[PDB]
């Protein structure tokens, strides 16, 4: 590819792999709408399979960008509304604390302290009902943001309900297919197992385990190729043929709440571009939010991104719609979010 692109990429990621002792990594850079690929290390140390443009990485929380979009698509389809109480799609949600809790609240982590992880002992639909029924809000809805799987995850599950499709049923046919992401899955087919990389946590090959609402919050696995297309799709949403998926993408990039200089979308998070590097280990930051009334439409001059991880994988997606620029980073080792963002900024800012 262009030697300029080739050079920041290699000069930033190389030491990054060395300092963080990252087994395998994949990187895509979207320059003026064209993807450039890079690959290092191993997808499976034991079998010496290297990382390739075909390797599957666990996206972790980056999965929330898909849930965000799929939900925006359901809104566009008129199957759900963000202004609707959560009880509309789950009538058995009788506890009185759900009253003024809307789908917008679930989707944006502002319901009032929904826990970061759904408890491991919640292993059944009925288990899931009781958990949400018995949850006690630490705060009033629309006052604080506490990032959580159990918040966005229930939103994903409720958003596809009117449709009658499973979440994965809706994801495939309403988002992966339309977008030609043929190597992106919530569940990896046996046919793709030879591309599924192992994650590395403390020296052992690990894969994410099943959990409640896992497909909706941290479940998708994908290649740098499909991720590149995913970034391409979120950069230029007007070039998408299926009309609700177009609207859906834009809605996910809308600004619903503001905290510091960070804005909260559906899955995606945004910062006004140009952005200061200072701005971009605290397992839990509760942050009050200012409501953006009404929500601002997706802003070209943003730095839209999202981190995500699992026991064995660390990933990051960042793109500036206005510069038609973007990057994707996928490693099979969970390493410091900050190093991810530094590397992202260094590459991208060096290309305008
Ligand atoms: C998304 O990636 C979320 N994490 C998980 O669901 C998850 C983790 C994990 C990894 C590092 C630190 C904490 C946790 Cl819980 N391990 O397995 C799973 C399924 C949340 N998003 C993360 C992010 O923004 O990168 C966190 C750390 C805020 S937790």
Summarize the model shown:
The PDB classes it as hydrolase/antibiotic. The entry lists the keywords beta-lactamase beta-lactam complex, enzyme inhibitor complex, hydrolase-antibiotic complex. The radius of gyration is 19 Å and the shape is globular.
Reconstruct the topology from this structure.
Layout lengths: L2 H18 L3 E8 L2 E11 L4 E2 L6 E2 L5 H13 L26 H6 L16 H10 L9 E2 L3 H11 L7 H10 L22 E3 L2 E3 L7 H4 L3 E2 L1 H12 L7 H10 L2 E5 L2 E3 L4 E4 L14 E2 L1 E7 L5 E8 L4 E7 L4 E7 L5 H13 L3
Antiparallel strand pairs: 1-2, 1-16, 2-3, 4-8, 5-12, 6-7, 9-10, 9-13, 10-11, 11-14, 14-15, 15-16
Bound molecules: cloxacillin (open form).
Cloxacillin (open form) (CXU) binds next to strand 14.
Relevant terms:
10 helices; 16 strands; 352 residues; alpha+beta
């Amino acid at each position: 590819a262009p030697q300029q692109i080739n050079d920041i990429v290699h000069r930033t990621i190389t030491p990054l792999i060395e300092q963080q002792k990252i087994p395998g990594m994949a990187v895509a850079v979207i320059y003026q709408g064209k993807p450039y690929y890079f690959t290092w290390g191993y997808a499976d140390i034991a079998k010496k399979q290297p990382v390739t443009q075909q390797t599957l990485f666990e996206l972790g929380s980056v999965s929330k960008t898909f849930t965000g979009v799929l939900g925006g698509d359901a809104i566009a389809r008129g199957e759900i509304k963000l202004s609707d109480p959560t009880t509309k799609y789950w009538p058995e949600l009788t506890a009185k604390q759900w009253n003024g809790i809307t789908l917008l609240h679930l989707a944006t982590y502002t319901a009032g302290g929904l826990p970061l992880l759904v408890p491991d002992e919640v292993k059944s639909s009925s288990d899931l009902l009781r958990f949400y029924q018995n949850w006690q809000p630490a705060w009033a809805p629309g006052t604080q943001r506490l990032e959580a799987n159990s918040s966005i995850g229930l939103f994903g599950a409720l958003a596809v309900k009117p449709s009658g499709l499973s979440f994965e049923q809706a994801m495939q046919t309403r988002v992966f297919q339309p977008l030609k992401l043929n190597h992106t899955w919530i569940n990896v087919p046996p046919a793709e197992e030879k591309n599924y990389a192992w994650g590395y946590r403390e020296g052992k090959a690990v894969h994410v385990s099943p959990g409640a609402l896992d497909a909706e919050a941290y479940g998708v696995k994908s290649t740098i190729e499909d991720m590149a297309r995913w970034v391409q799709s979120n950069l230029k949403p007007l070039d998408i043929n299926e009309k609700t998926l177009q609207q859906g993408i834009q809605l996910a990039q809308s600004r619903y709440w503001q905290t510091g200089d960070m804005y909260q979308g559906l899955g995606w998070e945004m910062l006004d571009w140009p952005v200061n590097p200072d701005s971009i280990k605290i397992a839990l930051a509760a942050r009050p939010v200012k409501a953006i009334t009404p929500p601002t439409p997706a802003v070209r001059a943003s730095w839209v991104h999202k981190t995500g991880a699992t026991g064995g994988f660390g990933s990051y997606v960042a793109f500036i719609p206005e510069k038609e620029l973007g990057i994707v980073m996928l490693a099979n080792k969970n390493y410091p979010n900050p190093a991810r963002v530094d590397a992202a900024w260094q590459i991208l800012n060096a290309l305008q």
